[PDB]
């Protein structure tokens, strides 16, 4: 019967990259399974396929929705099994699918109940994963390395530890060359994220952008894109660059981005109270991911916007009125906030204190003079070495 495929899959046991191909259909090889079909392996018995059939056990259970003996299985079985696979080199590639599930249910298990047995257990877990993270690191199997790394990163962020994961990266070198683009984007995802929480944005949008590029699409790969982009909007927003509407209308994902689509409406307008109200509105929704405490940083940005708009639309304004448009209590509050905005290269103004009105700087003629010469000159040179550079990297033909 259908077990022929399981035997046909064993016909993939010849050598080397076949396993790769062997995995591909094996991705969908789990469509049909039965406990009596389990007896197939009972009649089938080799170890190099023993671990694999254990994969089939995990896949069987997790899909069958029973997680108890899946993790229980992970321990009692995988540990004996784990020792045998260490000797093998090919097995490391196979185990990655294994590890991918191992952590999973355990993580998923945490959503059943709270116990410190889960703590000690997962301390053991991470400990192991770092152990043969080093072991495999010396064994030079790119794929299983990258996978494992991803799993422990995801552990740090199921935890609250960004730093430990960060300094962890500091001592990491990533198995760059030979990867699975999906794992690559899981990396770039987590990377961009933690790199953001630490308040460095300008490198986060990078790694998340790559998490958009390197990610596959299909119909299944959605949730990763949905989730990521739910982050990408946040970074784009914090950095001070409003995203365009079409970014909010793309695919099914547009139903999820809605709170962010209610943030930019709050942000672009620069109206604080509306913002805050919205944050209270969608808060719980924003907590199911951790984008929340990112978003609550925007209270700075929103006000920056408020000031910049009040500047572009007025040459000079009595402090009274700015304080009215921004709802704030006191003028004294204002000139702290505006004095701040100026230093950041936003307004380009000065402030008249004794009359208390902002005055924004003008263009002051001067075209008939030589200043345009200097300016154009700088711009010119800075165009040259662009041309230069683009011809120095050009050398390759």
């Amino acid at each position: 019967x259908x077990x022929x495929x399981x035997x046909x899959x064993x016909x993939x046991x010849x050598x080397x990259x076949x396993x790769x191909x062997x995995x591909x259909x094996x991705x969908x090889x789990x469509x049909x399974x039965x406990x009596x079909x389990x007896x197939x392996x009972x009649x089938x018995x080799t170890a190099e396929i023993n671990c694999f059939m254990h994969l089939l056990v995990q896949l069987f259970l997790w899909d069958s929705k029973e997680l108890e003996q899946l993790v229980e299985f992970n321990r009692k079985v995988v540990i004996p099994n784990l020792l045998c696979y260490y000797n093998l080199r090919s097995l490391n590639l196979i185990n990655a699918k294994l590890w991918f599930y191992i952590y999973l249910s355990h993580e998923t298990l945490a959503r059943s109940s709270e116990e410190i047995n889960s703590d000690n257990q997962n301390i053991i877990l991470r400990s192991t994963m770092m152990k043969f993270l080093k072991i495999a690191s010396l064994k030079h199997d790119n794929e299983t390395k990258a996978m494992l790394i991803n799993l422990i990163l995801r552990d740090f962020l199921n935890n609250g530890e960004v730093d430990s994961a960060s300094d962890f990266i500091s001592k990491l070198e990533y198995p760059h060359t030979d990867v699975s683009s999906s794992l690559e984007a899981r990396y770039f995802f987590y990377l961009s994220k933690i790199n953001a929480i630490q308040l460095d944005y300008s490198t986060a949008n990078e790694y998340i952008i790559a998490a958009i590029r390197k990610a596959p699409h299909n119909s299944k790969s959605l949730g990763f894109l949905q989730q990521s982009n739910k982050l990408h909007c946040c970074i784009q927003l914090l950095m001070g660059d409003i995203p365009e509407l079409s970014f909010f209308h793309q695919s099914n994902m547009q139903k999820s981005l809605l709170p962010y689509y209610h943030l930019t409406k709050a942000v672009k307008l620069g109206d604080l109270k509306k913002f805050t109200s919205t944050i209270t509105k969608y808060k719980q929704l924003l907590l199911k991911d951790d984008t929340y405490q990112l978003c609550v940083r925007l209270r700075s940005n929103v006000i920056k916007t408020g000031i910049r708009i009040i500047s572009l639309t007025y040459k000079k304004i009595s402090l009274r009125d700015i304080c009215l448009k921004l709802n704030l209590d006191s003028e004294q509050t204002v000139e702290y906030m505006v004095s701040r905005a100026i230093r950041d290269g936003v307004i380009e103004a000065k402030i008249n204190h004794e009359d208390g009105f902002i005055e924004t700087t003008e263009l002051l003629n001067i075209y008939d003079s030589e200043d345009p010469q200097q300016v154009f000159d700088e711009r010119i040179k800075f165009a040259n070495q662009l041309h230069d550079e683009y011809l120095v990297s050009m050398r390759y033909p």
């Binding site: 530890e161 730093d163 929480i197 702290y336 906030m337 004095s339 000065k350 402030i351 204190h353």
Partner: protein
């Protein structure tokens, strides 16, 4: 645990630690710590004592200092040796305003500088301004290639 995590030296100590991180101007580590403490304290009610460092951070993030300074006056209720940190943070704020106001506007009456920098003293002002190198006028402070060449330059850049 209920037994292991109790000691109120926690409640004061953590807050002390966060505040340390602010004192050192390490923002990265600070927010990282926020994210840390969040999942643990997630039972969190407002921020009970811990609002002192948090709130203390948010207000200077937004840029409204007066509330922040007010918090500096409000640490005395729970007071501990972070007063030293206070004297840190206090200075850590004033330069800001200074470093703000340098670009804000060139012209201030001395009483107004006292108003901004939260001095209780008139002379501490010009102490600070000298330390800031600000030339002071009687209560009132002030805060402040030929074309041929260019052508040949463009050429020689072109004909390489």
């Amino acid at each position: 645990n209920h037994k292991l995590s109790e000691s109120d030296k926690k409640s004061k100590l953590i807050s002390l630690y966060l505040l340390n991180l602010l004192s050192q101007n390490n923002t990265t580590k600070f927010h990282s710590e926020l994210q840390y403490l969040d999942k643990h304290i997630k039972n969190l009610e407002d921020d009970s004592l811990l609002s002192y460092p948090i709130k203390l951070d948010r207000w200077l993030m937004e840029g409204s200092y007066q509330k922040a300074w007010d918090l500096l006056q409000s640490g005395s209720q729970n007071i501990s040796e972070f007063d030293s940190f206070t004297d840190i943070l206090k200075s850590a704020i004033r330069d800001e305003i200074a470093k703000n106001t340098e670009l804000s506007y060139d012209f201030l009456p001395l009483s107004n500088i006292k108003a901004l920098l939260f001095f209780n003293n008139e002379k501490e002002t010009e102490k600070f301004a000298l330390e800031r190198n600000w030339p002071i006028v009687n209560s009132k402070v002030y805060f402040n290639t030929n074309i041929i060449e260019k052508a040949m330059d463009y050429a020689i850049s072109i004909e390489n």
